[PDB]
């Protein structure tokens, strides 16, 4: 048994990790074949972030303008061009260690592990959530622009997020491995705040579900609701709606419990407007929302 | 900024699982050198285990009933040996991926990555603390078994835990990698009970310590307290004597916040007596105590 924030493990990605450094901006690459993706901004000096004109700074960037770094291993740039908001630094060496691998651009509430990285030197793994309003509330100190996001599925790592910036509220936004920020973030120095967040009603509901699994069961009652008696409880405490595909996708883990979804929405409208009564679910004393259903079934096989 | 729990990469590790197979139980294995670490209990089976005589049971078996694979690739047993409550397997092939590694018995308190694995291949890597009852509050399945946990400290792994069972009430216990069980614990699938657990003080200081520096600030107060004056509180909430080495463990992360550890322990005297009342700290409604002080630390560098 047990239950916890779990990371896929991180030696696919740890292989691809490298250090880049244009002039004096340092920040951390993907070497993934010939090409290392970084941040565009690794192009832009400190006296050059509030308004930068990307297109017009690349091109006076030459190739030995770039130092690229895999450990100790020196990599000649051979080439440079623009990926959107990240940058493709075309290398002559192929990277002997490159997984399987994809880009996928993920939806809000979807979760993914994050490498942590400095210098081109990873320094750990954590397990986080693209929340409803595009921001992801990570760990990450500068210089650590270029951390990446993954999913790994039997053996093909799936890229899904870069991290750029820190939000001025402490939580970070980055884009897709394609460049494309999530979210309405610009890599420019303005007054960006993320969108009000929310919480992820069916991430809830899923961890709910991997509390019963696990011999937690105080919080279930014999009530029962209406989808749209819970959506509007759900709307109240800053909740997501509830739609039926959340339900159709909480199936599978309402029969291996037994628990119709609409019960365990029950027992959820209780705890928002009642609270927990200094109880604890799963070892918290918060409705955790960052565990998918998926991921509640990797940790709890039906068997 | 941020500040999450977040285990170290786990790659230097992946390469050394393998499964183990004895019979009709199926384990993981570590790989290291030219010797696989499992259970002793692999070689167990179904007709006894609630009082197994292992050196009977193993003096049944021969080198070839041990059947270890990495990856695609079978190891064949050279030799076979008991140490404690671990089998150690000879094989005939070095593991070309060994890491620089040490064996270490961790401390009560203390902090350690798990890397789980089934059938020798990894599944995900987490954060998790020795209790002071020398229990750790993991996920694991049937067949996890042989899951090591590990800190790295400048591209050494010291390995410290090696998982064997699961308690009844749903913590997990193992032994180190010498084979010698963290706890009154013996490798019997009979019902056998931890201790009562205590919260870990230190490692809770350190916690509020790495609220402050993120930010959160508003538990802070001018009082002050006396070594013997707070350990009396912590023996009615049931927390862990403080000592004159935690005060001076905490020492780095003081300068850094500029908030005495006497004055940081009158904080906490506070919130033990009175609840948090409604507040959160570093996203938490509850004191978290799986957080060392130099965890804290290697997530929140100072100068």
Redesign the interface.
Known sequence: ????????????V??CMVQVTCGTTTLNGLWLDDVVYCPRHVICTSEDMLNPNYEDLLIRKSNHNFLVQAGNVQLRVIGHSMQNCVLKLKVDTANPKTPKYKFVRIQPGQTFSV??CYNGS?????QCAMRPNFTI?????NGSAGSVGFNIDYDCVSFCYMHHM?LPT???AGTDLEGNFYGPFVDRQTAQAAGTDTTITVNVLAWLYAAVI??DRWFLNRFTTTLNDFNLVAMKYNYEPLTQDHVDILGPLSAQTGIAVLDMCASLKELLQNGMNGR?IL????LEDEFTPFDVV??C?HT
């Not at 048994?1 to 696919?12: C, D, E, Q, W």
């Not at 990873?122 to 954590?126: A, D, M």
């Not at 509330?137 to 100190?141: E, V």
């Not at 070892?283 to 918060?286: C, I, R």
């Open positions: 048994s047990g239950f916890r924030k779990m990371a896929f493990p991180s030696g696919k740890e292989g490498l942590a990873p320094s750990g793994v954590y509330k990570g760990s990450f100190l820190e402490g939580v970070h696990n011999g604890t070892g918290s004393a918060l990797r940790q096989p």
